[model samples]
Target: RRRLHSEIQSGSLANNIKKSTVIVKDPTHIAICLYYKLGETPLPLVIETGKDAKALQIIKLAELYDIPVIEDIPLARSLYKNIHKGQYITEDFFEPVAQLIRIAIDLDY
Candidate 1:
């Protein structure tokens, strides 16, 4: 009967939105940035940002990308909320961001 077809179609419809629904259920956005100190006035630069689903999706990509996540919520929140992608972060972040850059070079640990 057509009942089976309707049920199958409805099930497919439900599955379509399932991914997006689950993604935003308590979302936690993320930001990515970079730091370079060479020549003169080097500073940390914003790379990109994505929310829970889109953001978390890339930990898959972030793996070999080797960005070295710091897990500093405050820094992430500030950079995410304030700075736009493809721009340099403000002077306020110099202290915290540079600290990581400083230590990573402390023998690649």
Candidate 2:
């Protein structure tokens, strides 16, 4: 969550929210959420396919909640293909996820 907040504030990510995915994770656990916006909605649609969309709504909400806006097409594709929406990431992603957390922390400080 902290990492997410940091990324939201970093202001270095892409402005095009449509191609972005917000990766939420708990450092002490394997759980994660890949948020995407399909269209007009109150919240981002938790999607299984990380395809393209005008994700402006999700990006706005993410900023409101201080969530990180990650715009990595390859990583987003991999995440959606591997992990289901609202599920814990597999152990295979642990190390890399931790590294991401670390990078976020460093960027924050």
Candidate 3:
């Protein structure tokens, strides 16, 4: 079974190594996605909805670090199914890419 998190970028393993794991979506993997934040805050961390707080190790790591929690991914699958695929993607313009990640999460991968 897979748990869903609104902030999570893609699907993940149930019993993950850390709080969450990133699973590449689509029949063809061509994109990379992950959760990101501008800074590190030690607020209570949760993997997905209705789930337990992240393990102590995760909490500690998150408390001290701020980085884009990337998944082990290679490339994008649906570059054209977005509002801005023709253009090079930047974090400032990740809205469409993020939306695509959401769409991929809904499918049975």
Candidate 4:
């Protein structure tokens, strides 16, 4: 996906990826990245089932580790403002556990 570049490039945002991470492979042989530790706790996790079902799984895994997940757009939106136009986001973006750039499916709210 086009967003993969945004998630993988070397920058503050790129650092979000955990060096040692957790993952699960489903029956379809699809590899799903799960449970990444961000810089904070009780992190807001954007919940969009269906397309983000795998991400949800990651959240569940995170919960198992006593991590918190938040689902408020307003909060996350406000957090973005703190980041400058070209400043680039650190592991903080994933604090909301939405680091998966392109593969993200539009949540039908």
* Candidate 1, position 53, lDDT: 62
Which tens-of-lDDT digit does each residue in 23-57 have in candidate 1?
11112556344544454335656544566765664
The 10-residue segment of model 2 with minimum total lDDT is 24-33
TM-score of each: 0.59, 0.45, 0.23, 0.26
RMSD of each: 11.9, 13.8, 15.6, 13.9
What is the per-residue lDDT of model 4 for residues 1-109, given as tens digits with 9 covering 90 to 100? 3556645543322232232143322332222333323464243332122114544544554455433344444433444344332233446565443543212333333
lDDT of 2 at 68: 65
Q: Model 1: what TM-score?
A: 0.59
CA lDDT of every candidate: 0.52, 0.45, 0.31, 0.36
Model 3: residues >4 Å from true position, as ranges? 1-24, 29-33, 41-75, 78-93, 100-109
Which digits, one per residue and each the tens of the lDDT, describe model 2 over residues 4-103?
A: 7657744433333233344543222222234333354333334423232324434554576665654544544555567775455567766655455454
Clashing pairs in 4: 13-89, 44-70, 45-70, 94-97
Total backbone clashes of candidate 4, pairs 3 or more residues apart or in separate chains: 4
Best of the candidates, TM-score: 1
Question: Which is better, 1 or 2, measured by TM-score?
Answer: 1
Using alpha carbons, what is the TM-score of model 2? 0.45
